Design a protein around this ligand. Sequence first.
Ligand SMILES: Nc1nc2c(ncn2[C@@H]2O[C@H](COP(=O)(O)OP(=O)(O)OP(=O)(O)O)[C@@H](O)[C@H]2O)c(=O)[nH]1
Ligand SMILES: Nc1nc2c(ncn2[C@@H]2O[C@H](COP(=O)(O)OP(=O)(O)OP(=O)(O)O)[C@@H](O)[C@H]2O)c(=O)[nH]1
Ligand SMILES: Nc1nc2c(ncn2[C@@H]2O[C@H](COP(=O)(O)OP(=O)(O)O)[C@@H](O)[C@H]2O)c(=O)[nH]1
Ligand SMILES: Nc1nc2c(ncn2[C@@H]2O[C@H](COP(=O)(O)OP(=O)(O)O)[C@@H](O)[C@H]2O)c(=O)[nH]1
Ligand SMILES: [Mg+2]
Ligand SMILES: [Mg+2]
Lengths: 37, 426, 426, 428, 428
Amino acid sequence: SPPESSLQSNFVPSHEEVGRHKRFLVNSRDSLQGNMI
Amino acid sequence: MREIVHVQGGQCGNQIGAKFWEVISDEHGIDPTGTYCGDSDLQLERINVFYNEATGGRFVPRAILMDLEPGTMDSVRAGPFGQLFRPDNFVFGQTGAGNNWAKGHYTEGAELIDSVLDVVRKEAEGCDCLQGFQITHSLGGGTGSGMGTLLISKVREEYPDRIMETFSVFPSPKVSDTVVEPYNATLSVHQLVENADEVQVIDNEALYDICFRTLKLTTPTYGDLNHLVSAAMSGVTCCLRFPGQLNSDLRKLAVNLIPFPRLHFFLIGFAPLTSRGSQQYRALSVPELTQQMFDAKNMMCASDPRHGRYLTASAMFRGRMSTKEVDEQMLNVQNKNSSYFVEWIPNNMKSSVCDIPPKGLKMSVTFVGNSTAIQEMFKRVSDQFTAMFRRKAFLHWYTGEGMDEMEFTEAESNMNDLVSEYQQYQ
Amino acid sequence: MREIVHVQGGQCGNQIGAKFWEVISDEHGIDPTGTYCGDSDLQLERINVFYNEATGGRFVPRAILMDLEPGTMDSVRAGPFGQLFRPDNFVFGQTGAGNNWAKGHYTEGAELIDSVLDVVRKEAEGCDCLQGFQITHSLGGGTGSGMGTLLISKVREEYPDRIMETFSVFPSPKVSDTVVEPYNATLSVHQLVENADEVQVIDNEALYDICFRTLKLTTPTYGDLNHLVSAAMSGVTCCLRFPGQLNSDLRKLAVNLIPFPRLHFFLIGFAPLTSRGSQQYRALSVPELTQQMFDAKNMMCASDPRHGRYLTASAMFRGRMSTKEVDEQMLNVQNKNSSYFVEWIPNNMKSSVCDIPPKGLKMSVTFVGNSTAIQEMFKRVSDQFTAMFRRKAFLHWYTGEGMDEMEFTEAESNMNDLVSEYQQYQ
Amino acid sequence: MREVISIHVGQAGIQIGNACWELFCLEHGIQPDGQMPDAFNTFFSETGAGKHVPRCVFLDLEPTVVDEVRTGTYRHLFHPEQLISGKEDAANNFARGHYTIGKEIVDLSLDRIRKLADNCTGLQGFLMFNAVGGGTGSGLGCLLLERLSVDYGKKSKLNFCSWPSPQVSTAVVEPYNSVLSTHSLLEHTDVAVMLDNEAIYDICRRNLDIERPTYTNLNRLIAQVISSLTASLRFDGALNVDVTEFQTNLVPYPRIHFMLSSYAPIISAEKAYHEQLSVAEITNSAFEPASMMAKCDPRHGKYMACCLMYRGDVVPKDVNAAVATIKTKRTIQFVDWCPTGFKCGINYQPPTVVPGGDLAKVMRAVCMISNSTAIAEVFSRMDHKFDLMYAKRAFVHWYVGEGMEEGEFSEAREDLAALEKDYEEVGI
Amino acid sequence: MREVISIHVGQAGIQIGNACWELFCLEHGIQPDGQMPDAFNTFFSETGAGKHVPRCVFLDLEPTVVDEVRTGTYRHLFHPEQLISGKEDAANNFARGHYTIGKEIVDLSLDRIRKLADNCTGLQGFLMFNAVGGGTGSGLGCLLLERLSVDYGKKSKLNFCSWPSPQVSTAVVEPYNSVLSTHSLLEHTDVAVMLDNEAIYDICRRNLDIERPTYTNLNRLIAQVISSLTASLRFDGALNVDVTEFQTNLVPYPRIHFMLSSYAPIISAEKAYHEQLSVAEITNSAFEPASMMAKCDPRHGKYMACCLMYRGDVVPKDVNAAVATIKTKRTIQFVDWCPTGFKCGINYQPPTVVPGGDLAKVMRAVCMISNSTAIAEVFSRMDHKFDLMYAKRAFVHWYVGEGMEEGEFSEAREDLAALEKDYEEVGI
Ligand SMILES: Nc1nc2c(ncn2[C@@H]2O[C@H](COP(=O)(O)OP(=O)(O)OP(=O)(O)O)[C@@H](O)[C@H]2O)c(=O)[nH]1
Ligand SMILES: Nc1nc2c(ncn2[C@@H]2O[C@H](COP(=O)(O)OP(=O)(O)OP(=O)(O)O)[C@@H](O)[C@H]2O)c(=O)[nH]1
Ligand SMILES: Nc1nc2c(ncn2[C@@H]2O[C@H](COP(=O)(O)OP(=O)(O)O)[C@@H](O)[C@H]2O)c(=O)[nH]1
Ligand SMILES: Nc1nc2c(ncn2[C@@H]2O[C@H](COP(=O)(O)OP(=O)(O)O)[C@@H](O)[C@H]2O)c(=O)[nH]1
Ligand SMILES: [Mg+2]
Ligand SMILES: [Mg+2]
């Protein structure tokens, strides 16, 4: 088997690439105009 | 119609500009997936000022993410409203400017400035004619100051007749971060004073002082300081997005705040501002809207305007309200504070009515004012820059990355001349 | 009515035309077993231009599968849409050309070209009247460059007045494979310049440039790049199969691109081309189509048109679209980019409207342009050829097949006078 | 994308390196096989089924510590020629490191570095660990830095070299080995960070009340330091600190890059059950001279620059309140030409505790690296006990008879004397 | 239709045919009886009911290595008369091996090479594996190459000649045998490739880390070379390279047909799963000067052509990306009359590892055959060794009285110096 086509007839790529992340640790923040809890 | 072009540079600009697109998507009823909800005429009758219809029905922001390291680009797309932006608006560096001016301005910001003007021209020439450029970045670091302001140099050459609106966050006097700050700050200031049509100043000392006294939070983070800048930056552009009894725009601010083009530095205020302890106890009306807004505690610069003199100023009133109590109260604040207002200018105030109030409130105001009290943090930058430069400390980076020495002597002399010309009008 | 005969040679050509007969099968509703699907009258009103009715219900291609080695033709047949082609339209070689123009053109290209002339005479004379030929091959190899171009020669003599429209892929100069490329490149140009009516240049690093910058493909295979140029092959012939408000033809391209018979070398662009991380973000309109098409990033020839002058150009649009914007956009780019558009021709470029767009897209555009920037591509192939022929390298595989040195110098002369002829029009 | 190469020369580098990489394996989740039951990229590579092999070389001229790593637990984590070994020890000699044994091992060493660097662009720099008192840690450690400057010119090169004590040195010819290593690393090292063994012994005795720990317990505490330096390179945080501003914020002059460190909190589980861990007091502990990392008193030294690396659940508000407290504090004095004196970097990941170790699970920590004028005294005591033994030709016949000539001692003597004059001139 | 004929002479040729056909039987599914439980048509011919039969001749005048093959496991696979045996050893003698004792075995060998190459037209070429230092490898190899040149002149003549090393020569009269053999290797051999023993000795010593390797492990590496040689000929690929492509892309002058070889990766199981052996990490090791399989140092030579063949799941994106960094590095250099020097072949099927051998199951591999000006050095010390021992008539009486004449040595001396004058004439 040769490698398959990675483009549809719509002429766009077929599979995504997961971006190189940074080990996202979230931060809980919200303020002003009610400013939560 | 008109088109505000936003550019979002540096680590600091990428967080304060992301929170900006959280609240403008709030004001226009935009979902984080790009669609629309809310069912109102007033949310999208003027939507081309900040958004583009992308033939998927979504409203992509006309804002470009711009940094020399993908650490901040990773964060702004992982969180909420990161799906709103286009990945082609993101421009990536890989090396990173380690808070050095020549690092971003001469060596490795030179090869990414060709790619980022390609995306500026992609969205500028795609419309008929735009209204202005809105430049948020950081002068304390490197990728915001040096790599940021050569963009300011280049787009002014291509579009000299358009307005040049910059919101720059300054080094702060009390907190000591990014220890080579006075080199980055001074080398950006003298070059943007001949280049930017008008500049507004944000300092993290003043945003902390707001959370000390007016918001009375206990643990304010950077996201809380972001929405302080973001609520003010929404308010300064609200009349271009919404109707009103008295319409205005950014060059209305420019013609009504700038008697001389060398002096174009402003202070920002924003009222009302309380926590829930005073949300139901304070009469939301025109007296304390104007009177909190003329307070040093509410100022977003680390300056006391009581020290200086208000040369010119403007107020951006938002919401359905009585209009006498807007402008006659600014006549009373001029009569009571006649010593605080400059003597050869009668009616220092520009006013406008932006009849759609912001979300969650019914009355608000945004301050943009040219005060000669903005001299004082140029003085403390001058004192600490010449403290580092009289014995040439931390200089070998700024020499070895292709940048000369008399470029620094003209940098100090230009800003000293800017300080001296603010004295003669006080 | 008319018929365009695809003649498809070299191991590059057979696998770049397998993807060509996949896209015109998809656009025309051809099941790979041969039967029609999709029950649309516009989708089969013009079939006789590329397919012939088989009196068994199927639509056999008018394709001339051509190679000197029996391997790539077996892989094309074994793949999908490879059982569409007539088995007798394949012509088989048993020895092959070893990237050798001598055995490609003279010795091993002679005993097989008598069978190719038999099959191309059989299908063409069976038609009522021809429209042209579509020569797709490679110049960096042995069989496509060797007797694909001798096939170009003799059907030009035997058919003197028809159209000969060739998609030839030049050798990739930056990252060069098949080390004796400039012998097969330069010395097949000077033969082809008096025997080809219309030429389009394809470069492999340009095909990698559009896969990297505009498609952001992580792993681009040959199937991707053969699929991208088949967008050009279908977009250039859209009006041959489909109606339009303004019509065209390959003859229209001939009469509206060359003011002189020698300058038939063209560049090719295709728009739109975006990833699906930015497909929902793409506003798809006529002004955004033309400006993204008019970039060296998008053009599938590896020559910079900013260093040259577009002497003549053309733009086939596709899709239901307004016909004031099918010209006011080119008045915008001619007035803005007048430095890149030559003066002694007024209004350098034409357009036509095809009504059916490619499937999945509502509008598209292909571009065939006679730009004088190709002088930097022939002179760049020149400095490898004159350096490798000065010191007599790899020449005994050439002179040892009924051959001498005189037409190598004639190749240098007949190509550098094409370089110098493009010199006088920049 | 991002990657950093760690080089460990000498058996001091070996023992600091095995504990440094066992924390990284427990920090990202690498089993002793190199599998993950994505910040590994900045310290661990990839090769298919989770195989996250390390990006570090291990130089030693003698095999007696390297091949017992091969025999030990971490066999298949490390690539086998990343562990590079000779046959004979340099045995406390600068000449034995350079000219007789090191010339035959440095060709294979740069062969492995070149293959391990050209795998992907994005190399921030090299982290050097060595012993200046030793033979291969100072001699071969010099010649690696000579061959790294000639090819990898513009790349950053951090340094963490174990300076000997005024008292605990366990050698006699470390006066020769150390000051010949200075003539190496004034002009080849970009940022030099100083270490000292009794300055880790007195932290283990006082801050954890551990009366009999060993060399390996020193190596956990320093492993926590290097992991905190690369905290922002791997994990996310509010203020990113990569390697390029360890030098442009802490090095004011190219010949002034010798600098100090400190770590806090170093608190056991039996003391963390009573003391509250606030950001204000962990940085107050990092400013105490008794909590210092290389035994250099900063009362007579004058802080030119500093860096703070907060790691954990540190809110930026009390970062700025605590650092304003030390400007008010008079006993930590700073320089008049550097009024601002601080670069702050916040990372959200808490410090990773090793079970069976010495530390507990704390929610916040500081890694402070400060360039101060106090580094003048650590070389002035080097002045006094070098001239006290060089004056009567003691231990000189080993050096002169083994390739290196007399006179290189005198120019390296004038080199560190010039370093003394530079630190006195900048400290006015 | 398509077939290739291998030819082996000498004891070295016989066991180098045993390794390359232990491998080719193991990848084509060929049991030692030949029964499958159309890509095989190059090396095996369909005979009867599902039997595949070797396409070669095994040639040796001494029976001591060949009749032990016909009593072995592969004895019902091979045809009996394809293995042709003599009666007496040539005994390091060009005079006997060409003239005296080698003339009664050529009539059987040319009968079988006719009966094997006449079954189908379109024969792809002949391969030759000879021992240069041997007696029948040099003598019989020369004369039958002469007779196959007059019979089949227009067919390819591949050769992988096993040359004596500068220090490893395992005999005494290698100056006579090799210089006499290269007089005719120059004139009627279309392709020559040097396989020096000590170079492949070193490669097994450091890459595969076997410090007692034997001629078996030497022979497996050549088997991997010939497998990735004709991988494109046997199986399909992204870009085919034919055997005719070799001379058209590596031989710019008919006299210069002497090229090099290199195989990478040759990693061992233990060291295998420890590197992402990527289309680059493996093409950098293929171009490494010490990874040479004939110990011709190319840093003092100029590359005049190079052919790379990839074998596995190789995308050509990083083929072009990695070969660009090969082109840009200045430690490699090309002669200016070949601005490009690269012919690439791609085969989809990965190489197959032999059980119990010394390689590992590797997904992608590179074999690289480069023509260079650095062939002048293997003939330059050949000049030194021949004249140093021809000076005083050593071993001359074994050649003069056994068929040749005094003066063959002078002209074989002369035309090798003509090869040197021709190589330096390219070398400006
Ligand atoms: N902190 C720490 N210091 C060590 C360690 N091992 C050795 N040292 C220091 O190194 C000095 C002795 O030199 P070594 O490192 O053992 O020798 P070397 O640098 O490998 O060079 P050679 O003497 O040739 O083996 C001692 O005085 C210690 O200060 C260790 O595991 N941890
Ligand atoms: N590459 C390779 N060469 C070998 C091998 N075995 C022997 N040789 C070469 O063969 C040479 C000696 O000749 P032999 O092959 O033993 O004997 P021969 O070719 O039959 O010729 P005679 O010496 O007359 O018996 C040595 O110089 C080696 O270089 C092997 O396993 N691999
Ligand atoms: N206004 C504002 N300032 C910030 C924010 N985050 C950090 N800062 C300030 O910016 C300085 C660091 O800037 P830096 O990120 O290095 O700028 P960069 O070079 O553009 O990345 C610190 O002194 C902070 O006080 C923010 O979210 N808003
Ligand atoms: N665009 C394109 N180029 C190809 C393709 N296949 C091979 N090539 C290029 O063609 C050159 C080899 O010529 P080739 O077609 O194989 O020789 P030929 O079949 O005898 O003409 C190589 O440099 C490849 O880069 C293909 O499918 N598409
Ligand atoms: Mg030693
Ligand atoms: Mg022999």
